[PDB]
C-alpha cells in the first residue's frame with residue numbers, strides 16, 4: 153500500500169551482493185505499490201566531509217568555525233549546501249529509511265557516515281531539547297540492512313567480534329533513535345563471500361520475503377538492555 | 383625518546399578545543415624529544431571514500447569491483463594511491479598513534495572514518511591470520527582522544543547515551559585491537575563547550591600532564607568485559 157521508502161545505499165559495485173539486496177528491496181517495495189527512492193552514494197560522488205563549504209551564507213562566527221553551530225543556523229536560514237537539502241527532502245518524505253551497506257570497521261563506510269554527519273543536522277533531525285523519543289524524525293521508521301565479512305558465529309557474545317548487537321549501538325541508538333526514528337530489527341546478511349552461491353540466493357530471497365510483511369513489524373526497543381543484555 | 387608519534391587529527395578549526403588538544407600533544411611530545419608527525423585530515427582535504435581510484439595501474443578483477451580484494455592485492459603489488467601509502471608509512475614508523483577528534487554520532491567524523499577504512503587495509507594492518515592480539519600493527523600503541531557534546535553523566539550505563547565504553551567498542555576493539563594495537567585508556571574530554579574558560583584549561587592541562595608519563599602506561603584489556611561487563 154501507500155508508503156514512501158528511501159534506501160540509502162553505499163556500495164561501489166552494482167553487481168555486488170549489496171547491490172542485489174538493494175535491487176530486491178526496490179523490486180519488492182515497487183511491486184507492493186510503495187513509492188521508492190534510492191540515494192546511491194558512491195554513484196552520486198556524495199561528499200562525506202563536514203566542512204565550511206556546507207554553509208553558503210554569512211557565518212554566525214567567521215572567526216572560529218563550529219560545524220554544529222553554523223549548520224544549525226544555515227538550516228534555519230536555508231543556506232545549507234543543496235546536496236544536504238536534497239537528502240533532507242527525501243528523508244522528510246519517507247515513511248521508512250533503509251540503509252544498505254557492508255560493515256566497515258564495525259560501522260558504516262565513511263561515505264555513509266558522511267551522509268549521517270551532514271544530512272542529520274540540528275534543526276532538521278533533532279534539536280536541543282528534541283532528541284531520542286522527542287527527536288524531529290519521530291513517526292518514521294529506520295532499518296539497517298548490513299552485510300559482513302565475519303560469520304554469525306564470530307558475532308556472538310562469546311565469539312571474537314562480540315555480539316552483532318554491540319556494533320549496532322552507535323547507529324541504532326546514538327544516531328537513529330536520537331533523531332526520533334523507531335528502529336526496525338536489523339537485517340544482517342552474514343559472510344556472503346564465504347557462503348555458497350545458493351546460500352547467497354537464499355539470503356537475497358529471505359530479505360525479499362521479509363519485505364513482504366515489513367509494514368506489519370513492530371520496532372525494537374532501542375535500549376541498552378536490548379543491545380547489551382544483563 | 384627514542385619514540386615516534388603520529389597524531390591523526392580531525393577538526394576543521396585550528397582555534398578549537400580539539401586544535402588546542404592537538405597542539406599541546408605536539409608541544410609536550412616535542413619537548414620530551416619524541417619524533418612527532420600530524421596528519422591534519424581536513425587541511426589535507428583527505429579523501430574519505432573507498433573507491434577504485436585507491437588502486438593505480440590496472441585491477442585484479444575489472445569486471446566485479448571488490449574494494450577489499452583489490453586493496454589487498456594493491457598493497458602487495460605496491461599500487462595503492464599515494465595518499466594511502468603516505469599514511470601507511472606514517473603509521474608503520476609510529477610507536478604511538480593518537481586520534482584527536484570530536485565525537486560525531488557516537489563515532490569518528492566521516493573524514494577520519496575514511497582514513498581508517500582506506501589506510502588500515504588488508505596486508506598492512508591485518509590479514510588471515512593476524513588480527514586481534516596477532517594483528518599486523520602489534521607492538522604499536524593507539525589512543526583515542528575524543529571530545530563530546532554530551533556530559534559524563536549522560537554517558538553512564540543508565541544515562542540517556544549509555545556508558546562511553548559502549549561507543550568505544552567499534553573503534554577500540556573492532557578497529558584498533560583488530561589491527562594489533564595496544565589500546566591506551568581513551569582520553570575523553572566531556573562537553574568542553576558548556577565548560578568554563580578554566581575547566582577547559584584544566585582539561586588541556588590534564589591531557590598535557592598525562593602525556594608526560596604516557597610511555598609508562600599499561601594498555602587497557604581490550605575485551606568485551608572491559609567495554610560492557612560487571
Ligand SMILES: Cc1cc2nc3c(=O)[nH]c(=O)nc-3n(C[C@H](O)[C@H](O)[C@H](O)COP(=O)(O)OP(=O)(O)OC[C@H]3O[C@@H](n4cnc5c(N)ncnc54)[C@H](O)[C@@H]3O)c2cc1C
Pocket residue numbers: 163167168169170171172254255256257258259299300301302303344345349352353356446448449450498499500556
Ligand atoms: C574497509 C573494510 C572494512 C571492513 N570491515 C569489516 C568489519 O568490521 N567486520 C566485518 O565483518 N567485515 C568487514 N569488512 C568486510 C565486508 O563487510 C564484506 O566484504 C562485505 O560485507 C561483503 O559484502 P559485498 O556486497 O561487498 O559482497 P560480494 O563479494 O559482492 O558478495 C559475495 C558474492 O555474491 C555475489 N552475488 C551478488 N548478487 C548475488 C545474488 N543475487 N545471488 C547470489 N550471489 C550474488 C557477488 O557477486 C559475490 O560473488 C570490511 C571490508 C572492508 C573493505
Ligand SMILES: Cc1cc2nc3c(=O)[nH]c(=O)nc-3n(C[C@H](O)[C@H](O)[C@H](O)COP(=O)(O)OP(=O)(O)OC[C@H]3O[C@@H](n4cnc5c(N)ncnc54)[C@H](O)[C@@H]3O)c2cc1C
Pocket residue numbers: 216218219220268269270326393397398399400401402483484485486487488489529530531532533574575576579580582583586
Ligand atoms: C555531526 C555531529 C555529530 C555529533 N555527534 C555527537 C555525538 O554523537 N555525541 C556527542 O556527545 N556529541 C556529538 N557532537 C558534538 C561534538 O562532539 C562536540 O560539539 C565537540 O566534541 C566539541 O569539541 P570542539 O573542539 O569542536 O569544541 P570547541 O567549541 O572549539 O570548544 C569549546 C570552547 O573552547 C575554546 N578553546 C579552544 N582552545 C582552548 C583552550 N586552550 N582552553 C580553553 N578553551 C579553549 C573554543 O574556542 C570554544 O569556545 C556532534 C557534533 C556534530 C557536528
Ligand SMILES: COc1cc2c(C)cc(=O)[nH]c2c(OC)c1OC
Pocket residue numbers: 257258300301302303306313450556557560
Ligand atoms: C577490515 O576488514 C575486515 C575486517 C573484519 C573485522 C574487523 C572482523 C571480522 O570478523 N571480519 C572482517 C573481515 O572479513 C573477514 C574484513 O575483510 C573482508
Ligand SMILES: COc1cc2c(C)cc(=O)[nH]c2c(OC)c1OC
Pocket residue numbers: 220274280326327330487488530531532533536543
Ligand atoms: C548530532 O549532534 C549531537 C549529537 C549528540 C548525541 C547523539 C548525544 C549527546 O549526548 N550529545 C550530542 C550533541 O551535543 C549537544 C550533538 O551536538 C549538537
Ligand SMILES: [Zn+2]
Pocket residue numbers: 324325326329330373374375376
Ligand atoms: Zn535507542
Ligand SMILES: [Zn+2]
Pocket residue numbers: 554555556559560603604605606
Ligand atoms: Zn579488544
